[PDB]
Amino acid sequence: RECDYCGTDIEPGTGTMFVHKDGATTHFCSSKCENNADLGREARNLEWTDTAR
Amino acid sequence: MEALGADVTQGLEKGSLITCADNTGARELKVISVHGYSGTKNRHPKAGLGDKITVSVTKGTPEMRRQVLEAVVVRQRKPIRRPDGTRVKFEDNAAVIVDENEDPRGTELKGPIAREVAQRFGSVASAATMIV
Amino acid sequence: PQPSRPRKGSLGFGPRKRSTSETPRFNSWPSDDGQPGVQGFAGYKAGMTHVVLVNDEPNSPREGMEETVPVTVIETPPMRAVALRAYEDTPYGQRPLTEVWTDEFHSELDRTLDVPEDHDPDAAEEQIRDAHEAGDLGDLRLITHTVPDAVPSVPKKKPDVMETRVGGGSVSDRLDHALDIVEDGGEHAMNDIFRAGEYADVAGVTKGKGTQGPVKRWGVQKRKGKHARQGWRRRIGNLGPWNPSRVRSTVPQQGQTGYHQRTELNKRLIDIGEGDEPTVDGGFVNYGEVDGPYTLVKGSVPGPDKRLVRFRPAVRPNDQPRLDPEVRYVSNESNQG
RNA sequence: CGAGUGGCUUGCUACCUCGAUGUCGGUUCCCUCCAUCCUGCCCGUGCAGAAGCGGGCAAGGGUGAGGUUGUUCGCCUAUUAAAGGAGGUCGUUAGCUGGGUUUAGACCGUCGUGAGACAGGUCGGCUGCUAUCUACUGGGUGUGUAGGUGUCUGACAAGAACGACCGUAUAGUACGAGAGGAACUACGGUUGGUGGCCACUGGUGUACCGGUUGUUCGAGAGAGCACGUGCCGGGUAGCCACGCCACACGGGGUAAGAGCUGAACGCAUCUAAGCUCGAAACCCACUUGGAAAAGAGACACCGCCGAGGUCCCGCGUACAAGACGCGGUCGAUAGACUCGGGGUGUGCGCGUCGAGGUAACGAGACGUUAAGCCCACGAGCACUAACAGACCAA
RNA sequence: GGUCUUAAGGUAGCGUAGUACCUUGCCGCAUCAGUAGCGGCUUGCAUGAAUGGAUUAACCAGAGCUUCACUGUCCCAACGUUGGGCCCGGUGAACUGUACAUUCCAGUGCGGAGUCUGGAGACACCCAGGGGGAAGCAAAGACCCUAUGGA
RNA sequence: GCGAAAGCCAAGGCCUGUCGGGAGCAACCAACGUUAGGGAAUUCGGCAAGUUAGUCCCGUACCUUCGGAAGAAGGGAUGCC
RNA sequence: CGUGGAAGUCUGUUAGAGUUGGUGUCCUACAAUACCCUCUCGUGAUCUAUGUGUAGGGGUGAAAGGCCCAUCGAGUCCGGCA
Ligand SMILES: [Cl-]
Ligand SMILES: [Cl-]
Ligand SMILES: [K+]
Ligand SMILES: [Mg+2]
Ligand SMILES: [Mg+2]
Ligand SMILES: [Mg+2]
Ligand SMILES: [Mg+2]
Ligand SMILES: [Mg+2]
Ligand SMILES: [Mg+2]
Ligand SMILES: [Mg+2]
Ligand SMILES: [Mg+2]
Ligand SMILES: [Mg+2]
Ligand SMILES: [Mg+2]
Ligand SMILES: [Mg+2]
Ligand SMILES: [Mg+2]
Ligand SMILES: [Mg+2]
Ligand SMILES: [Mg+2]
Ligand SMILES: [Mg+2]
Ligand SMILES: [Mg+2]
Ligand SMILES: [Mg+2]
Ligand SMILES: [Mg+2]
Ligand SMILES: [Mg+2]
Ligand SMILES: [Mg+2]
Ligand SMILES: [Mg+2]
Ligand SMILES: [Mg+2]
Ligand SMILES: [Mg+2]
Ligand SMILES: [Mg+2]
Ligand SMILES: [Mg+2]
Ligand code: NA
Ligand code: NA
Ligand code: NA
Ligand code: NA
Ligand code: NA
Ligand code: NA
Ligand code: NA
Ligand code: NA
Ligand code: NA
Ligand code: NA
Ligand code: NA
Ligand code: NA
Ligand code: NA
Ligand code: NA
Ligand code: NA
Ligand code: NA
Ligand code: NA
Ligand code: NA
Ligand SMILES: [Sr+2]
Ligand SMILES: [Sr+2]
Ligand SMILES: [Sr+2]
Ligand SMILES: [Sr+2]
Ligand SMILES: [Sr+2]
Ligand SMILES: [Sr+2]
Ligand SMILES: [Sr+2]
Ligand SMILES: [Sr+2]
Ligand SMILES: [Sr+2]
Ligand SMILES: [Sr+2]
Ligand SMILES: [Sr+2]
Ligand SMILES: [Sr+2]
Ligand SMILES: [Sr+2]
Ligand SMILES: [Sr+2]
Ligand SMILES: [Sr+2]
Ligand SMILES: [Sr+2]
Ligand SMILES: [Sr+2]
Ligand SMILES: [Sr+2]
Ligand SMILES: [Sr+2]
Ligand SMILES: [Sr+2]
Ligand SMILES: [Sr+2]
Ligand SMILES: [Sr+2]
Ligand SMILES: [Sr+2]
Ligand SMILES: [Sr+2]
Ligand SMILES: [Sr+2]
Ligand SMILES: [Sr+2]
Ligand SMILES: [Sr+2]
Ligand SMILES: [Sr+2]
Ligand SMILES: [Sr+2]
Ligand SMILES: [Sr+2]
Ligand SMILES: [Sr+2]
Ligand SMILES: [Sr+2]
Ligand SMILES: [Sr+2]
Ligand SMILES: [Sr+2]
Ligand SMILES: [Sr+2]
Ligand SMILES: [Sr+2]
Ligand SMILES: [Sr+2]
């Protein structure tokens, strides 16, 4: 699995999956990715993100 | 009860106000008790994903309001742990009103439901639209 | 009428003082059954990682599925059974009779012991066998020591010495089994005693925390609400009633917490290998890199990294042995982060 | 109607205390009692079953959360296996609380000519002390046993280290017309308690990196101050719980009870002698402490001109002093450096762009730049520092 | 009762009240559950008209009650910051002190004992700690009675 | 900046709100910062802490002695160039 | 609509005055009435300095038996007095 936010591979036996109100699902590899997402930042706009680079 | 298949950190207590994820006419529920639970001195009785709870209707239709009913916890904000180590958390805390036989009082369920809850309460699951 | 409530903490691990030996001392050993064999081994704690295992439990709904299991990596290089001590049965319990030592000693055993220069293994053996003919032989145990030098992550070279009981078939067969092991040089490995998938009891001296108060040491509550603002936050209500006019040792008080011997039961051994498969990127924090004989113990193990931990075949297992679990994955992701 | 036991209620007495022993309730923390609420094992039934009801042994463990009221009590609600009662100065202010009671202010009703009063109500209203002794929790130094190192023994001591529940199979079975509806046993999980641990999730993280407001250093760069971070965002190590791991089976002796054999008393009789069974309770099992156990212990090796130890030095798996543990060139113990592994989020400078603007100027954008800065971790590496060296010792 | 004491015999209003003993009065509202609070009833133990009654916009560090929002008050505690605390140099008091004193369990005793009795335990000294006991220290009580006391 | 407000800085003054040294510096206490999920369940009582907040625009109930209630409430906006 | 600028008027740590709560800190104190935060007032029956007056069964008192130099239901000193 890849982190639906940054794009890196989620280490097996790690991370969290957030279940949206509409039933959608977001697999986060870490708290950092979750926190940046909560601030409304889009992964492509953050240089350190695999998605961006 | 039948093993949940996941480890839960109870995210609710006696007195918590949660969402009623169904079409019974009850919009908001207040946790009053947790089925089969026994705490300890000073400890607030806790409830979480998969637990059956006695509840009170705080918001909703006039006929439903103030009624003391049973319900099943379908979603919670505090993470739960699945066998493969992944944590799972929802956008809100929700329960579905249930009867003496554990069949949902309402006809339709609103929002996603945890698979673990779906397995424990089959009839509650069959009414589910999305099982995550 | 004042709600009931269990007391704060167990009275079974007292007194809560600093341990006399940093090296753990088992206070019990397994039963005597099949083939004779050393009833214990030891290693050094490195750190933890997780593993993905295939469910073995035949009574589990998840039998045959992937499962993530926490694992503590312990470096378990070969040890040396340097001597065979015999105990005789006396009206005052068991007492050491004699010991049969060797010639081959590790290059740095002299950092702890006064290595024998003139010894007579045959006279000791003779004395032991004579005691057996008389039926006064209590039990047989091996003086064992670790080889810290084989573990780079551990600074010490001074071997850690402990006594490990030898149990097995009849006394004659294990007396001979013991002597065989010792005579070689005493070299034995984790493999010789344990098989991956079995349950072991792990002993170790816990992490030290120096002096700590009742809240952390015994789990007593903190003063609540207004009672927390008057000048008392982490102090208990009272040291006792008016009568008896003395403070009972049972009241939760401040003192040494940690650095105590603990013996944790039923620790499943996930894998016994050798090399760097379990090692972590960047190295185990405050430890180093693993690349040698190791043991993956399910869950936690008492003590900090670098501490000597002891293994022993489980004396009171709850479940049946499900040998050689299938390890699909072993995390090597950095522990820093 | 009669006979008792307790000392939980109330009354009685005035024996102790008024050059002063801080009232009620609660809270917190510890020990206990049994007249047992649950749990274990039993007996009877107006015992089919399921469930009741009554009784016996039994104090191991448990007995919780909430609404009014200061309440104790009690009423009430939903949970529960059950939500038992009592003693410890009606345990517990040199522990807390100040809501009740019970000063000085004030109001009401009633009483009083009045000052004032009330075993009525009401609003406000003060709690000091640096522990000498003893007690206990933890930590040291000495003496005794009587040169050193290592390993043990186990008299004693502590434990609840484990208690309880739900679910599945048994089984829609036994039982019962039906309705209803078990058990042995084997499994899965939960809860309360207990000990430990940090890979995972979560918290912190005034290490660190970034953004940004006011002001000062002329601007830029880079900084100070705005409380021990100006504010905001992220967060390594570490510490943590909201996270993770572990906490029997089985023996032995019994109670109540079910029985065997069996006599006094040819019979009968579980009892008088003897015996087979039988409780969550008792003992063992398991964990923890424990050579100062005065019968002051055991074994092996080393040494008595030298074993070992101390000072010293580099350090932490240790730590309030002390103690403990490791390394000291026969070396990787700490640091520098370089890698690795991490945190933040794209540096200064310069170039292009940029709404505009004659121009000056210009917030900002892109590139250089997976940049820059930083690291309590790891590895490599003797480069620096563990040098020099003093001393005790049968 | 369908007057009598002692003049009159409570009118408007308000009312279970800061007044109502009974009392958690009854009905209702609100809450899962409300000796509280509010509305109504009210025969008021013992309301009531400048001993002022009723009512009231505005005002209030005045008493009580409810709701929304919020949060470590709580579930249940954690980590961190600064000053102490601990160790070292220097400076350097006070409270308190019949005596002895290593105590513990029972008992006894003017019935609430470290010191009496019987047992049990107990090698000496020192550091830190929270305060169980010394009916700890601080005051010839802050309650009650007494005095041919005081104001 | 509304300001004799805060905060920062001059002129001027001071390091005398006058004992120091050491331990990542333990327990415990005083003042504090940050705390997941629940959100007053705590308590006699939201005590303590917190929430809100400046300014402009929209909009503003019962009741009223017509003054007031009222900043009721509720909603939106806010920098730089 | 504007002007005007009233008020024992509002906000306000302006100066200044005061002190609801914390039942916080202190309680051999910094202090025989102190410290911090919160809180109240702040154009008036306001606050404030100096001067001046009222004296003990007497003053003064928007009244608490409050105050009259750390003492007041009758000051302090000495005397009556051993
Ligand atoms: Cl408390
Ligand atoms: Cl409940
Ligand atoms: K008295
Ligand atoms: Mg409680
Ligand atoms: Mg980590
Ligand atoms: Mg991560
Ligand atoms: Mg008397
Ligand atoms: Mg006293
Ligand atoms: Mg009985
Ligand atoms: Mg008991
Ligand atoms: Mg009492
Ligand atoms: Mg006391
Ligand atoms: Mg006190
Ligand atoms: Mg005190
Ligand atoms: Mg009151
Ligand atoms: Mg008066
Ligand atoms: Mg009062
Ligand atoms: Mg009424
Ligand atoms: Mg009149
Ligand atoms: Mg007196
Ligand atoms: Mg007096
Ligand atoms: Mg009096
Ligand atoms: Mg008289
Ligand atoms: Mg008089
Ligand atoms: Mg939280
Ligand atoms: Mg309560
Ligand atoms: Mg407040
Ligand atoms: Mg004047
Ligand atoms: Na205090
Ligand atoms: Na007391
Ligand atoms: Na009696
Ligand atoms: Na009390
Ligand atoms: Na019991
Ligand atoms: Na109650
Ligand atoms: Na008393
Ligand atoms: Na007090
Ligand atoms: Na009290
Ligand atoms: Na038995
Ligand atoms: Na009247
Ligand atoms: Na006022
Ligand atoms: Na806090
Ligand atoms: Na004491
Ligand atoms: Na000086
Ligand atoms: Na006009
Ligand atoms: Na004040
Ligand atoms: Na006078
Ligand atoms: Sr009590
Ligand atoms: Sr041992
Ligand atoms: Sr032992
Ligand atoms: Sr206080
Ligand atoms: Sr006593
Ligand atoms: Sr009994
Ligand atoms: Sr029973
Ligand atoms: Sr009482
Ligand atoms: Sr009552
Ligand atoms: Sr009071
Ligand atoms: Sr009362
Ligand atoms: Sr009264
Ligand atoms: Sr002697
Ligand atoms: Sr069943
Ligand atoms: Sr049926
Ligand atoms: Sr600063
Ligand atoms: Sr702000
Ligand atoms: Sr019997
Ligand atoms: Sr000895
Ligand atoms: Sr009338
Ligand atoms: Sr004696
Ligand atoms: Sr102290
Ligand atoms: Sr200057
Ligand atoms: Sr000075
Ligand atoms: Sr932070
Ligand atoms: Sr409340
Ligand atoms: Sr409450
Ligand atoms: Sr607004
Ligand atoms: Sr004004
Ligand atoms: Sr003002
Ligand atoms: Sr007060
Ligand atoms: Sr405060
Ligand atoms: Sr102070
Ligand atoms: Sr004071
Ligand atoms: Sr003005
Ligand atoms: Sr004077
Ligand atoms: Sr005189």
CSV table of C-alpha atoms (C1' of nucleotides) in Angstrom, one decimal, chain E residues 31-125:
chain,number,residue,atom,x,y,z
E,31,U,C1',-33.9,15.0,33.6
E,32,C,C1',-32.3,8.1,32.0
E,33,A,C1',-33.2,9.4,37.2
E,34,G,C1',-34.2,16.3,40.2
E,35,U,C1',-35.2,16.4,49.1
E,36,A,C1',-33.0,21.3,44.0
E,37,G,C1',-35.4,25.1,40.6
E,38,C,C1',-39.8,27.2,38.1
E,39,G,C1',-45.5,27.3,37.3
E,40,G,C1',-50.2,26.1,39.7
E,41,C,C1',-52.9,24.5,44.0
E,42,U,C1',-52.8,26.3,49.3
E,43,U,C1',-57.3,25.7,55.0
E,44,G,C1',-51.1,30.6,56.0
E,45,C,C1',-47.8,25.1,62.8
E,46,A,C1',-47.0,30.8,63.0
E,47,U,C1',-48.7,35.9,55.6
E,48,G,C1',-50.8,40.9,55.3
E,49,A,C1',-51.0,46.4,54.5
E,50,A,C1',-45.3,53.1,56.0
E,51,U,C1',-44.0,46.7,62.5
E,52,G,C1',-45.9,49.1,55.2
E,53,G,C1',-48.7,45.2,51.2
E,54,A,C1',-48.4,44.2,46.1
E,55,U,C1',-45.6,45.1,41.9
E,56,U,C1',-41.6,46.5,39.2
E,57,A,C1',-38.1,48.7,33.9
E,58,A,C1',-33.1,49.7,35.2
E,59,C,C1',-28.8,48.5,38.4
E,60,C,C1',-25.6,44.5,41.3
E,61,A,C1',-17.9,41.2,42.9
E,62,G,C1',-25.7,40.0,46.6
E,63,A,C1',-28.8,34.0,47.1
E,64,G,C1',-30.7,29.9,44.1
E,65,C,C1',-32.0,27.2,39.2
E,66,U,C1',-31.7,25.9,33.7
E,67,U,C1',-29.5,26.1,28.5
E,68,C,C1',-25.8,26.8,24.4
E,69,A,C1',-20.6,27.2,23.9
E,70,C,C1',-15.8,25.6,26.1
E,71,U,C1',-12.3,23.0,28.8
E,72,G,C1',-7.5,17.9,32.2
E,73,U,C1',-13.1,19.6,37.2
E,74,C,C1',-13.5,14.3,36.1
E,75,C,C1',-12.6,9.3,33.3
E,76,C,C1',-6.7,8.9,34.4
E,77,A,C1',-3.1,10.3,34.2
E,78,A,C1',1.5,11.8,31.1
E,79,C,C1',5.5,14.7,29.3
E,80,G,C1',7.8,19.4,29.6
E,81,U,C1',9.3,24.7,31.8
E,82,U,C1',11.2,28.0,35.8
E,83,G,C1',12.4,28.3,41.3
E,84,G,C1',13.3,25.1,45.3
E,85,G,C1',14.3,20.3,47.1
E,86,C,C1',19.7,16.7,46.9
E,87,C,C1',25.5,17.3,47.1
E,88,C,C1',29.7,21.1,48.0
E,89,G,C1',32.0,26.3,50.3
E,90,G,C1',30.5,30.2,53.6
E,91,U,C1',27.0,32.2,57.0
E,92,G,C1',23.8,30.4,60.8
E,93,A,C1',18.9,30.9,64.3
E,94,A,C1',14.2,29.2,66.6
E,95,C,C1',10.3,26.0,68.4
E,96,U,C1',10.9,22.1,72.1
E,97,G,C1',13.5,19.3,76.3
E,98,U,C1',10.8,15.4,84.4
E,99,A,C1',13.6,11.2,83.4
E,100,C,C1',14.6,6.8,80.7
E,101,A,C1',13.5,5.4,75.8
E,102,U,C1',14.9,-0.5,69.6
E,103,U,C1',9.7,-1.5,69.7
E,104,C,C1',5.2,-4.9,68.5
E,105,C,C1',0.7,-7.8,70.1
E,106,A,C1',-2.6,-8.7,74.1
E,107,G,C1',-3.8,-7.7,79.0
E,108,U,C1',-3.8,-4.5,83.4
E,109,G,C1',-4.3,0.3,85.3
E,110,C,C1',-8.1,6.9,87.5
E,111,G,C1',-11.9,2.3,82.3
E,112,G,C1',-7.5,5.9,75.9
E,113,A,C1',0.4,2.6,78.2
E,114,G,C1',7.3,3.4,74.4
E,115,U,C1',8.0,2.8,80.5
E,116,C,C1',3.2,-2.0,84.6
E,117,U,C1',2.3,-7.9,83.2
E,118,G,C1',2.9,-12.0,79.7
E,119,G,C1',4.7,-13.1,75.4
E,120,A,C1',6.8,-11.7,70.5
E,121,G,C1',10.5,-9.2,68.1
E,122,A,C1',15.2,-6.5,68.5
E,123,C,C1',23.5,-6.1,65.9
E,124,A,C1',25.1,-0.3,66.1
E,125,C,C1',25.2,4.1,63.4
